[PDB]
Design a protein around this ligand. Structure first.
Ligand SMILES: *[C@@H]1O[C@H](CO)[C@@H](O[C@@H]2O[C@H](CO)[C@@H](O)[C@H](O)[C@H]2NC(C)=O)[C@H](O)[C@H]1NC(C)=O
Ligand SMILES: *[C@@H]1O[C@H](CO)[C@@H](O[C@@H]2O[C@H](CO)[C@@H](O)[C@H](O)[C@H]2NC(C)=O)[C@H](O)[C@H]1NC(C)=O
Ligand SMILES: *[C@@H]1O[C@H](CO)[C@@H](O[C@@H]2O[C@H](CO)[C@@H](O)[C@H](O)[C@H]2NC(C)=O)[C@H](O)[C@H]1NC(C)=O
Ligand SMILES: *[C@@H]1O[C@H](CO)[C@@H](O)[C@H](O)[C@H]1NC(C)=O
Ligand SMILES: *[C@@H]1O[C@H](CO)[C@@H](O)[C@H](O)[C@H]1NC(C)=O
Ligand SMILES: *[C@@H]1O[C@H](CO)[C@@H](O)[C@H](O)[C@H]1NC(C)=O
Ligand SMILES: *[C@@H]1O[C@H](CO)[C@@H](O)[C@H](O)[C@H]1NC(C)=O
Lengths: 48, 239, 242, 126, 48
């Protein structure tokens, strides 16, 4: 839901006030992605 | 120019918070443990970061400091003088001697002797006084004494007269141990050595045997490369 | 600060420190004398119930259309080269038209602004330097000419100028929301202390609910209050009593 | 605020004269001082300007290499050193003052000034 | 991303219109943290 996938692009075009919001969206997304990955691996490891 | 050792000296209470039997990790300006303190028995010293001053006294010879960018009449410079009764601290543009032995808005009036002070930036002064038996072995915390909201620019300082030592603070992460009574009893410099990194990672003073992942090694880029296609087909500015 | 005879130029904005006093903020937020009254990370009403170690009133003058540049993370000549607010600013910005005072027949040129600088200012940085700006590759050596300009320029303040170009007086209140002893409080009155009961307490703005008991903690003469492991307040020092 | 001019008068061609202009009365600030001249029946014409801060000077082409403008901040006085005088230099010379700060020194050649002196005659003879 | 890690502080500094936003940030954060804790406990309980 951010303006771009690349952090550098946001940094270099959007100024900090708006850039911060976009980066917050990007952070939230990947942090959720990492959490999902970890959870799945935990369950997979239990099985193994 | 002599070098002796800051074994564990330069520890002060970071803020006004009271913490008991809890280990607290803080990023602040603390003197490096086990670095060098230059030894002098009066030279001009630049105040780059906070400075650690440590005086070994026989007869209380030294009792004053000047703290100013140029230490001269033209800009207002901080001047602190003790004479065993009152600590006269003034921030005016005072004409200062070649060898010292107005517009002053702010004003305040109050080897066995080891006196340790930390001065940092407005202005903050911590200190501690102890008896001693060239820099003593051990650990002790400095309680804050003064907070001057003067906002005076200070990039250089001098002493006003006995041995003393000078150290320079650095922005280093420390782990501090608070005892039953909220007194600081031990510390760890999280960047001194790999063992200390481990201690700081675990938030403990005791690492039991094992292998611990502490940090991440990463090569830094040395330079920036920018490439674009050859310049051509100018705009018709000539026209 | 508000009733000051004269104001400072934006490039050399004045700073007044406020300490050790009671602040009746009503006189400001009840007054109708102000066009812009914008408070960040604080509501004015609540200021009556709050204490601070220090307050900074930064005073200066700009033209109307640049008042928007007095805000966190704005860009332009003012916010870049004259007076920069931090992105995490916590305080109030007050601005009101001063055409009746700062403008005169023929144009008031006493008020300046910095037009050139080699980099943007840091928050609350003050640059009063008059160095010749080197716009090009040729050193100026303090000599004005081609690509060598004086960094400052005057404001054209005439009574007939558009509201956009008319002079506006600006006051910026910043608060020291530190944990340290607070000398700048609001008008709110104090009461008696009740121990060994569940109460809704407020100590110098530190609000909470709990039971207040005489402690045995070895607080230091300077230590204001204490926390437990969870980063929550556990013990305090009475503002009125040691 | 008054601008009080002095010096000048009669001098033979090739000679040098110095004009002074003292600023009296309470000033908030001075941006720049200038000298202008008006020859009989002709338009008043820019001669030289000096920025109060820094002392950078700007000259009409007709006086370059011959005239020097200078300032004494403490005395609130501007000077025009008029060397290598020519008949063409005969005119009433006027001191001018402004509080207008332009980034661009050359603006002082064309800026309408706020304050004017009474004028001092310079007459260059053979 | 909020202006403070305390809730009372926000309530004592802002009006509802904006305290809402800050509190939303705090709630999101802590709810995520609780979900993580419970998830970890679930599989730990599985193995026990
Ligand atoms: C404090 O005043 C001094 C006066 O010179 C200034 O610090 C100088 O800063 C420049 C810019 O980097 C350096 O090149 C000089 O080395 C500094 N001078 C000295 C004496 O160290 C500046 O106006 C103020 N500095 C600070 C820290 O605010
Ligand atoms: C230390 O020097 C100061 C310089 O005057 C003296 O401190 C004064 O103490 C007297 C007595 O109370 C006060 O009336 C003055 O206001 C103080 N002056 C200032 C500016 O501090 C004092 O004479 C000296 N103390 C000694 C000799 O022990
Ligand atoms: C906290 O303070 C108490 C009170 O002073 C300390 O208890 C004393 O300990 C010393 C030596 O450590 C003894 O001489 C006293 O007899 C003790 N006093 C009491 C009242 O028992 C205690 O050591 C301090 N805690 C720490 C670890 O700093
Ligand atoms: C000891 O002194 C040497 C000689 O200059 C210096 O390089 C070094 O920093 C000092 N060692 C420490 C870390 O105390
Ligand atoms: C004190 O302030 C006045 C007012 O600006 C100034 O004229 C004077 O130079 C200052 N004193 C010193 C020695 O800096
Ligand atoms: C005009 O021609 C001259 C001489 O060839 C050259 O220096 C200049 O760059 C030209 N102007 C433009 C705008 O191209
Ligand atoms: C005011 O505060 C002081 C603190 O030193 C205290 O001694 C005094 O009793 C207080 N007065 C009242 C009436 O609260």
């Amino acid at each position: 839901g951010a303006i771009s996938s690349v952090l550098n692009d946001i940094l270099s075009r959007l100024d900090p006030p708006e850039a911060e919001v976009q980066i917050d969206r990007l952070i939230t997304g990947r942090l959720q992605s990492l959490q999902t990955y970890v959870t799945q691996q935990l369950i997979r490891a239990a099985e193994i | 120019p002599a070098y002796t050792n800051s074994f564990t000296r330069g520890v002060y209470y970071p803020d006004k918070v009271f913490r008991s039997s809890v280990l607290h990790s803080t990023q602040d300006l603390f003197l490096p443990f086990f670095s060098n303190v230059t030894w002098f028995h009066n030279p001009v010293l630049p105040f780059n970061d906070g400075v650690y001053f440590a005086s070994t006294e026989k007869s209380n010879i030294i009792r004053g400091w000047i703290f100013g960018t140029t230490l001269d009449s033209k800009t207002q410079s901080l001047l602190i003088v003790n004479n065993a009764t009152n600590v006269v601290i003034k921030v005016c543009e005072f004409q200062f001697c070649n060898d010292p032995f107005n517009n002053c808005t702010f004003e305040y009036v109050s080897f066995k002797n080891l006196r340790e002070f930390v001065f940092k930036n407005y202005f903050k002064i911590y200190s501690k006084h102890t008896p001693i038996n060239d820099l003593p072995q051990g650990f002790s915390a400095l309680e804050p004494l003064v907070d001057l909201p003067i906002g005076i620019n200070i990039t250089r300082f001098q002493t006003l007269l006995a041995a003393y030592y000078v150290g320079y603070l650095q922005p280093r992460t420390f782990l501090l141990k608070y005892n039953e009574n909220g007194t600081i009893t031990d510390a760890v410099d999280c960047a001194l050595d790999p063992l200390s990194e481990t201690k700081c990672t675990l938030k403990s003073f005791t690492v039991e045997k094992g292998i611990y992942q502490t940090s991440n090694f990463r090569v830094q880029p040395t330079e920036s490369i920018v490439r674009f296609p050859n310049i051509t087909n100018l705009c018709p500015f000539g026209e | 600060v508000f009733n000051a005879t004269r104001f400072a130029s934006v490039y050399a904005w004045n700073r007044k420190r406020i300490s050790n006093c009671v602040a009746d903020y009503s006189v400001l937020y009840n007054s109708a004398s102000f066009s812009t009254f914008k408070c960040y990370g604080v509501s004015p009403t609540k200021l009556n119930d709050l204490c601070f170690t220090n307050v900074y009133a930064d005073s200066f003058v700009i033209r109307g259309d640049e008042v928007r540049q007095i805000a966190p993370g704005q860009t332009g000549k003012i916010a870049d080269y004259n007076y920069k607010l931090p992105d995490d600013f916590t305080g109030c910005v007050i601005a009101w038209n001063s055409n009746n005072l700062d403008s005169k027949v023929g144009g008031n040129y006493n008020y300046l602004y910095r037009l050139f600088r080699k980099s943007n200012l840091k928050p609350f940085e003050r640059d009063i330097s008059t160095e010749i700006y080197q716009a090009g590759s040729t050193p100026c050596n303090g000599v004005e000419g081609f690509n060598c300009y004086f960094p400052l320029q005057s404001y054209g303040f005439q009574p007939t100028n558009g509201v956009g170009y008319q002079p506006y007086r600006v006051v910026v209140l910043s608060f020291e929301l530190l944990h340290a002893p607070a000398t700048v409080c609001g008008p709110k009155k104090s009461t008696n202390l009740v121990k060994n009961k569940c109460v809704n307490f407020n100590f110098n703005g530190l609000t909470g609910t709990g039971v207040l008991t005489e402690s045995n903690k070895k607080f230091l003469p300077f230590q204001q209050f204490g926390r437990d492991i969870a980063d929550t307040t556990d013990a305090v020092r009475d503002p009125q009593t040691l | 605020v008054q601008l009080v001019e002095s010096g000048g008068g009669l001098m033979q061609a090739g000679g040098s004269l110095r004009l002074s202009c003292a600023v009296s009365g309470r000033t908030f600030s001075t941006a720049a001082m200038g000298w202008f001249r008006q020859a009989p029946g002709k338009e008043r014409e820019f001669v030289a300007a000096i920025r109060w801060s820094g002392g950078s000077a700007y000259y009409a082409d007709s006086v370059k290499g011959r005239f020097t403008i200078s300032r004494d901040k403490a005395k609130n006085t501007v000077y025009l050193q008029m060397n290598s005088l020519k008949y063409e230099d005969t005119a009433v010379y006027y001191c001018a003052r402004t509080e207008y700060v332009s980034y661009l020194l050359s603006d002082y050649a064309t800026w309408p000034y706020d304050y004017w002196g009474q004028g001092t005659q310079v007459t260059v003879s053979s």
